[PDB]
Amino acid sequence: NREEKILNREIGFAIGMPVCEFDMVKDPEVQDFRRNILNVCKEAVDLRDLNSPHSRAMYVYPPNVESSPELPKHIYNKLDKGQIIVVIWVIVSDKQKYTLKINHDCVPEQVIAEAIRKKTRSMYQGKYILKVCGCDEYFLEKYPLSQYKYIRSCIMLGRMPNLMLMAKESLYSQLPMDCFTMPSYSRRTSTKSLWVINSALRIKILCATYVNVNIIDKIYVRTGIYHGGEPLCDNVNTQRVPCSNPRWNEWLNYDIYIPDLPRAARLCLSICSVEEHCPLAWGNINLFDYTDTLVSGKMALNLWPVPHGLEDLLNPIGVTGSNPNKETPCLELEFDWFSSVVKFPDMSVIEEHANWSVSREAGFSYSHAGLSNRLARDNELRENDKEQLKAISTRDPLSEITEQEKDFLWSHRHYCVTIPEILPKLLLSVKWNSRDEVAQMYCLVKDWPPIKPEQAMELLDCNYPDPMVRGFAVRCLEKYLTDDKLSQYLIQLVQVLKYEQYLDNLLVRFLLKKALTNQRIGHFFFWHLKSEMHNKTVSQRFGLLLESYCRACGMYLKHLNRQVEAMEKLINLTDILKQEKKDETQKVQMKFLVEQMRRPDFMDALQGFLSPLNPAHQLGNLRLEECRIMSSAKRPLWLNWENPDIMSELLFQNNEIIFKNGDDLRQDMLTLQIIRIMENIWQNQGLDLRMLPYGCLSIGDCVGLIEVVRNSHTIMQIQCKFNSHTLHQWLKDKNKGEIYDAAIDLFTRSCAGYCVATFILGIGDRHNSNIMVKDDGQLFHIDFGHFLDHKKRERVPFVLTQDFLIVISKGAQECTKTREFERFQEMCYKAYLAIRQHANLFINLFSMMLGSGMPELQSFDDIAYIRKTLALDKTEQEALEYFMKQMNDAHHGGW
């Protein structure tokens, strides 16, 4: 138990709260979560000690690979007859290099043998491993060399891959053997079915405590029964009462039969003032608990404050459950009593019912089917009907499905199985207050054909609360989501956890198992959860989840605790500079910083740890002379560490990170993720528009890290050394001679990609201080704090000034009327249309981010902006015409 107390101290330090605080939670759901999740921990630890030491090394250093070994035409043609030049370094005392020309699809074992052949010609194979020079990135698995992200990046950038031969035992001996230990908490009327209760739904509103307002006058409680965002019946209000005495003692009757209540049904309520009706406090509750039990008896629900922007009286897409703060409006509710415990029926009872319904419908006469548009006969399915179904399935997730299409999709639900990507539309067409239809939907979902992971992700958002539906989505992720794509969408998958009704669910088990079997996923999983630990709407869920992750991640908890301590020291320093030294000069502030940083406690916490931006990067000794307070808003810290890697000169000798305390970095994180997804779509279609999605990580409440791009300057820094020719002059000066055209091409291409990306996403206004350019000519944007409809009718955030057109047109006077400008336009058109073709992906990435309290992403109407910029109701020619007009009005001619 001495080991357990010390480990509980480590977990507490990592999570930010003491582990004893969980042990004090009375809630049986919380205690069952802590216990039951431990089998995911056990399965994951078993997988790691399955083929030791290799399986342990694969967990710690997973291959950083692309999803497909297939190289796009433009990328493959960058190779010399499908061959790549590679540099293999061998440490012999001294550093010896061996240059190899090998096929791109060579396995690391082939590369090692070719390297030993060259070393022998200068005068075993499975006793070595290839490492990337400069970082802790290893090639432990037998993939084609070009499938590794490092190599694919080298081919695309005309770079020389620098690999190092390392002895397997030099790596194996450095990987500590941890033993996962099961914690102390591992060792812990009648019952009737819901479908047997021949009664209507009723709930009693008793009274409200902690209703502190400005004597606001007459108040009432507004209630509704919801299934996700869909109302199951009409909303029921209490009688008006004075705020000075909030007492109702009233039963509210709902237009819903208790056996008709879906599994994920919720009571959505709010205390409203009044005619200008205004919500004061809101709260949501699950009608069934985690044990599938219908709510009974008395219950007190602590309510939440109204979000600035919500004018709606109820808030169904808000969080479910009581507010952890007990010094808030507290509404007492009483539920019905049935002289027994009521449970939702099990699968077998639901299947018997669905099979009974299917069989009964199959015997319906022509005239019976004619009574309802939701009933149709098997043989009466024409080729036109099948065409309309296929057409409906191509519509985007924000396209309204009329009541007629809903009846139509439901009556052809069996044909829908042949076009399985229609499932999200079919699910929104279901009568969720009819147990006959819901039971039939379950049986269709149970056996539904698998869909694409990016299509299944939609089924995990706020629109699909049903656990059978969510379980299907998770099964598609388990079978088809690669570790590369999981890493890419980890922020959306962590966000949708908030939409799970219960702590113990299929999604959380899938995510935890992946985090515990891949340290690269585990790292970002920990940081996305930890960064939101201040938010009291998810701190219990994320804290318990972090507790379970920290018990089984092994040795990585110790490395995480170094990054947590380094970040805390930096949060403490920046907090002092903004509260006690804000009005002092840069020199005075830098003197204060240098002194504080040099303290023994601080100095050691800020050196010798892994970059939270990229844990393959080691941060050694902090280089204090290169550290500075930046002139930008919130005055970020420019930080520089030595790369302690022996071959640091072959990658970067100093790792420079911007530490910023003051701004929400979540919108920046999402924009950068989208830019990368856009670039990925463009490269795959043979459209080389190189984007620069630099690293950005939120590490707490308005705190985070930004990856510094080396050899980059703002437009202002360029022109401050002014003519419109200054930018073109600088580029021509940085790329003198034969390499001039490559810079112009790179500028034009990066420029086209940023015009299209920023116009689609509606990014904040571009100016000279937030547009940067690398020496080689690569243009990129920084500071993505604003997106979508952030004003109140569509904007062009990136208006190409004379400066940009002069570069594009190679110094010509009439830049608007050149062949270079026409080709720049064609690049924009192609780019715009390609994104239009993947609209569902983008819409779903944003929809999964709605529970995240981001100011510009609160409703589906905020996401609707992307439907306008991508012109989705219009045809492809009309969408191109619309893009050209937006550009023309912004530029006052040219398009």
Ligand SMILES: C[C@H](Nc1ccc2c(c1)OCCn1cc(N3C(=O)OC[C@H]3C(F)F)nc1-2)C(N)=O
């Ligand atoms: C030498 C120095 N180099 C530099 C500066 C800022 C960023 C950068 C490189 O890399 C690109 C990523 N980046 C992103 C940001 N920022 C951002 O996103 O918001 C404001 C600003 C920073 F002050 F935080 N700044 C940089 C320079 N040009 O003064």
